[PDB]
Amino acid sequence: NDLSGKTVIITGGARGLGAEAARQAVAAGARVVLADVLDEEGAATARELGDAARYQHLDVTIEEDWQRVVAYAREEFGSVDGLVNNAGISTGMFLETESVERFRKVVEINLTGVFIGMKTVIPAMKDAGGGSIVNISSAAGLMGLALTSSYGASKWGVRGLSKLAAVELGTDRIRVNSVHPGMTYTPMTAETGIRQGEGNYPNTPMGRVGEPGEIAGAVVKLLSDTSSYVTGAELAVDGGWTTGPTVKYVMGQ
Amino acid sequence: NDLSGKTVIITGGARGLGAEAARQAVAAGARVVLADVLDEEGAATARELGDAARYQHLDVTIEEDWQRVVAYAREEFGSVDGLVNNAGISTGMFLETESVERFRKVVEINLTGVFIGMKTVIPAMKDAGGGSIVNISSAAGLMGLALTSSYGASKWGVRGLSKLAAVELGTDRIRVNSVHPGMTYTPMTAETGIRQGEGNYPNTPMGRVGEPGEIAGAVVKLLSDTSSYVTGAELAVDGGWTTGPTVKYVMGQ
Amino acid sequence: NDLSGKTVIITGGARGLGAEAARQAVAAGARVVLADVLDEEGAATARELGDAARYQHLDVTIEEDWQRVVAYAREEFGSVDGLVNNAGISTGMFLETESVERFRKVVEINLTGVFIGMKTVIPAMKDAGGGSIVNISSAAGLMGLALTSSYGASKWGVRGLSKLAAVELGTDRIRVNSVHPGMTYTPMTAETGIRQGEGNYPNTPMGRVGEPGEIAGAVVKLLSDTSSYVTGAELAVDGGWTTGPTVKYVMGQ
Amino acid sequence: NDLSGKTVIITGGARGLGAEAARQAVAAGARVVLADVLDEEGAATARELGDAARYQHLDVTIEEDWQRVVAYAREEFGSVDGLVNNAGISTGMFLETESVERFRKVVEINLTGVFIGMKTVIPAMKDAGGGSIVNISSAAGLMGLALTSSYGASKWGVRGLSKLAAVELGTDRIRVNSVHPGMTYTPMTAETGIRQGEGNYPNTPMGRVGEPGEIAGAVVKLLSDTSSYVTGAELAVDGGWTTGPTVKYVMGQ
Numbered sequence A, B, C, D: 001n002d003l004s005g006k007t008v009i010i011t012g013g014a015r016g017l018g019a020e021a022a023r024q025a026v027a028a029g030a031r032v033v034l035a036d037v038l039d040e041e042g043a044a045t046a047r048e049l050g051d052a053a054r055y056q057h058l059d060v061t062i063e064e065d066w067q068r069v070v071a072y073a074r075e076e077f078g079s080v081d082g083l084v085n086n087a088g089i090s091t092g093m094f095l096e097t098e099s100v101e102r103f104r105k106v107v108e109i110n111l112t113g114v115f116i117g118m119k120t121v122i123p124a125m126k127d128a129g130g131g132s133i134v135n136i137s138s139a140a141g142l143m144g145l146a147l148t149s150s151y152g153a154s155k156w157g158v159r160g161l162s163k164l165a166a167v168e169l170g171t172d173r174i175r176v177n178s179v180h181p182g183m184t185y186t187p188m189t190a191e192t193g194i195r196q197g198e199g200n201y202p203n204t205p206m207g208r209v210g211e212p213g214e215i216a217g218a219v220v221k222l223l224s225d226t227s228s229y230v231t232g233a234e235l236a237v238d239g240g241w242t243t244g245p246t247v248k249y250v251m252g253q
């Protein structure tokens, strides 16, 4: 079992993967503080989850926004036990063609938003007695994914920040691990023409693209005390994408 | 949470981490076959797990043995959906010190013996339509652990066999992943001088050693369908021993 | 041996290992372009290395400072074949301590800084028939290193960027790799209490720290044509520091 | 730099990688000792390098063979400085397909073989006051390579034996590093239908198969004092095979 009688703040929780993550966690008996910069939906989402949700606005790149939400969650539910740095943005383009400003923007949200997320929540956690900080990274943060430039650098930096942090916080019973989903089906990626459904994606050994229910079960698992001895680790959720080239690619075509 | 309402053979399951994943998974709703070389212990252990547990003598390096336990599982139970490869033997000495004969024996039980398990059981899983192989590797398989010689090489072989098999079985619904515990508290390790408790093992970030219950949960999670997209992955359950040096170390002792 | 009778610009070139890499690249016939921000000391050095080198002021974070340095070399030796992105600043503090402002500051100098160099110098290398990008990183980008926060974070970022740039640039004859030097005895490091010599640094299997000359050789080897088939690679140059814990640590002291 | 004045025993030196590294090593002043099971071809190859080469018939799985050649090296030459474990056979068949006899056989040459090699030479090197052991692994040791069954499980095992040894021996001045070749143009790989040349392998970022002079050079560099601080490392000479998938593969196509 991966149950939860605690409170957790999930970022980028209005739509996408954060929405699912939150859906399952509340299902898991936890109370959730969704946080996004897209109100309309965060409002609805929490409005769907029920009495165990509460949506807050949160511009992940701002420590003020950050401290505000932390307090509010300590204030409302009485504790901050888990975090889910899930907010960020994609970069699909040939590095030579990327602008130094967009670059500065993806890293900012992807990389710093995460750090500002962690050092803020650490005190509320030393308070609880411990915490679980699941940073949602990517398959791209595990191998050199071409065409992800700024997205690539950031996601690899989230991977290292979660490790050093894991080392420093250990004695505090504060775990820090990264999750790395691969090509997962959602409306952002939907605009990428990703053939959803079994066997519809041939460049992953599993032959198919993952769905969010899949990546979310991983987060929750770590959020729980099931994994009371897991810290500074990386869990890829990509149907083998990252393990090695599939057969066809190895055969030479 | 994770539900394993299916069939699983556990290698080395009569004591320690094996028996632990035995009892825990049964609780999870699975039907377990304790395959092990200790008849007396495996008998007692299975005896106490109810009509959900069976004991069958198994020498991991004997292929005849394998085809029996696999056939009995499928006959007696109806099929085989998961295999937890937990059997092996440790090494604690400087490489130049190890006899080539010891070296081969260990690498035989640890690496070759999991190969038979995978090569054998595969046809039982393609049948049922899929399943999960969970190879119990080690912290000695994620970084170079000194003094482990044959066990180091052994376990790294498992991290690798695990991966290649996943890229191969990907599209047959057969899932394979490695599980890498760090200093866990087992009889084999109690002898060593290891002691459980907060602050009892400085040289690992969480300051202590894990118990088997914390490792099994990583296991049940992979066996369960909840991880239906985690293939060719490697999860460490070592309180950060493996993630990077300890603070004290990064500076100086 | 490793020959490089070609031209390369060296970022952070005025001092320490950026100065040693230049001292070496020149010895091997390189037309070296030292580019730092210490105009006064960078002129002393390029002066010292003779008529094989020039000095340019390069603020790594400014897109034009970058285009001018390239344009200077370009219209100076013929082309741009190699590039060593060595400029950066360190971080010695727990994450909870680093301000989000210092965080942005360091990351801007370490990550983006090297990115601006990659896309700026690229067209120069295309018109040169290809070449090699050598991104200096460190043990901090190879494992979770405590007390580095932003430096650990950007260093992992320069690792993941090298690789993605590698797969994208392969066909135009551009090789991208990251060197990963461990505790080396440079200017900034002598102030810590770091003593050079054998026996002096017990927490690395070699029991010593590295003089910059040993780190330089990797730069050059990767800059020469002797490594024509090396791309997306990562070479640790730390005396074993990131391979695994010291035997003493493994046994608990 | 890349100039030897030391004596090095290369294994599998009758033909291929061993043959190339032999030339170059000798070309950099190394007195080399070729070891092979091909008594006819190596004696030929040796006659080529001159009076700085020497052939011996060695069976890697025979410790007695090992103790003999190592004795001979220190007899004709007086010391043993390097070792290049290049012996080992391949595999290219699915897991379930391969026998338990062949597996135990490829493992024993590829893995146990390097083990005796390492265990027999270490003393000859302490006597010498230092040495460099280069174990030749493979891109199959770096990722889960499909159809490489037993060959994978040993290549991954050599990578791990290299690291734990590097640490056990560091303060002794003996470096252990693994090299990782990707699709390299040798006879059988050519007899695999591998069309040599630029652009002839679309499934590797560099778009081609490597040449042996290209893997030889990296072995040469790691064998010298030009990497005195390189221990516990792993270098990959694979044209980007390992960094990550082809742009084409990321787009799918």
Ligand SMILES: CC1(C)[C@@H](OC(=O)CCC(=O)O)CC[C@]2(C)[C@H]3C(=O)C=C4[C@@H]5C[C@@](C)(C(=O)O)CC[C@]5(C)CC[C@@]4(C)[C@]3(C)CC[C@@H]12
Pocket: A017, A086, A087, A088, A089, A090, A091, A092, A093, A136, A137, A138, A139, A140, A145, A146, A147, A148, A151, A181, A182, A183, A184, A189, A192, D250, D251
């Ligand atoms: C890891 C996931 C699956 C994704 O995954 C998550 O689940 C997000 C959660 C999160 O962000 O935390 C976030 C971004 C992403 C890294 C993604 C991206 O960035 C942009 C593109 C581009 C689209 C396209 C068609 C074009 O250029 O038009 C072709 C080129 C290119 C580069 C390849 C295909 C994708 C779709 C690419 C690389 C596939 C992998 C992908």
Ligand SMILES: CC1(C)[C@@H](OC(=O)CCC(=O)O)CC[C@]2(C)[C@H]3C(=O)C=C4[C@@H]5C[C@@](C)(C(=O)O)CC[C@]5(C)CC[C@@]4(C)[C@]3(C)CC[C@@H]12
Pocket: B088, B089, B090, B091, B092, B093, B137, B138, B139, B140, B145, B146, B147, B148, B151, B181, B182, B183, B184, B185, B186, B189, B191, B192, B193, C250, C251
């Ligand atoms: C892999 C783990 C962490 C452990 O792993 C698990 O618990 C999980 C997986 C599994 O159970 O296989 C199983 C035991 C073990 C292989 C272990 C062992 O055996 C014996 C010794 C020796 C004990 C002792 C007292 C001596 O013998 O002199 C002192 C010297 C010496 C050499 C120190 C190092 C250890 C402690 C050594 C090699 C470290 C790694 C260790």
Ligand SMILES: CC1(C)[C@@H](OC(=O)CCC(=O)O)CC[C@]2(C)[C@H]3C(=O)C=C4[C@@H]5C[C@@](C)(C(=O)O)CC[C@]5(C)CC[C@@]4(C)[C@]3(C)CC[C@@H]12
Pocket: B250, B251, C090, C091, C092, C093, C137, C138, C139, C140, C145, C146, C147, C148, C151, C181, C182, C183, C184, C185, C186, C189, C191, C192, C193
């Ligand atoms: C990455 C390397 C190995 C180093 O790397 C190199 O030498 C090669 C690569 C490169 O040059 O970048 C560059 C500097 C450095 C980042 C380094 C640093 O900055 C300052 C300190 C501090 C010194 C001191 C006295 C204090 O300040 O309080 C005591 C506390 C503290 C926090 C302990 C650890 C180190 C030594 C710390 C963070 C460890 C990692 C270290």
Ligand SMILES: CC1(C)[C@@H](OC(=O)CCC(=O)O)CC[C@]2(C)[C@H]3C(=O)C=C4[C@@H]5C[C@@](C)(C(=O)O)CC[C@]5(C)CC[C@@]4(C)[C@]3(C)CC[C@@H]12
Pocket: A250, A251, D090, D091, D092, D093, D137, D138, D139, D140, D145, D146, D147, D148, D151, D181, D182, D183, D184, D185, D186, D189, D192, D193
């Ligand atoms: C590790 C390297 C890259 C190689 O490495 C080197 O080139 C030397 C350097 C080193 O030592 O790694 C040694 C051979 C090998 C492991 C190799 C092999 O064994 C046989 C085949 C077969 C060729 C072919 C056409 C068939 O004939 O059926 C189709 C099916 C099949 C199974 C797949 C592709 C390869 C070519 C396969 C598995 C790809 C990986 C390959």
